[PDB]
């Protein structure tokens, strides 16, 4: 029961715990799809090529 309070808090946010981890686990794996497209203009590829065309 003493640790059930922890379950009443840690397991209360257990879905909140894991979901935030996977909402933070995608900040880098998505960076190779979501974060490369910002890089795709920040790598000067389109910045020079909007001017290149």
């Amino acid at each position: 029961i003493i640790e059930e309070i922890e379950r009443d808090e840690a397991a209360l946010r257990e879905d909140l715990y894991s979901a935030d981890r996977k909402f933070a686990e995608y900040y880098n794996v998505l960076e190779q799809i979501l974060g490369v497209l910002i890089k795709l203009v920040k790598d000067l590829k389109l910045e020079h090529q909007h001017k290149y065309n």
Partner: protein, 50 residues
Amino acid sequence: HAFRAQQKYERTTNYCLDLASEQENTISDQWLPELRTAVQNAQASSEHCK
């Protein structure tokens, strides 16, 4: 993170799609004059078809 993934990542995916098409839209706006210039070597090369 979602807004970072949306406004700073996905909207930049939109931007890197919009910026990659930003000159398209201008070119689409100036479609005939872009054809007058970017494809200017077509009508001149068309004169010697016959």
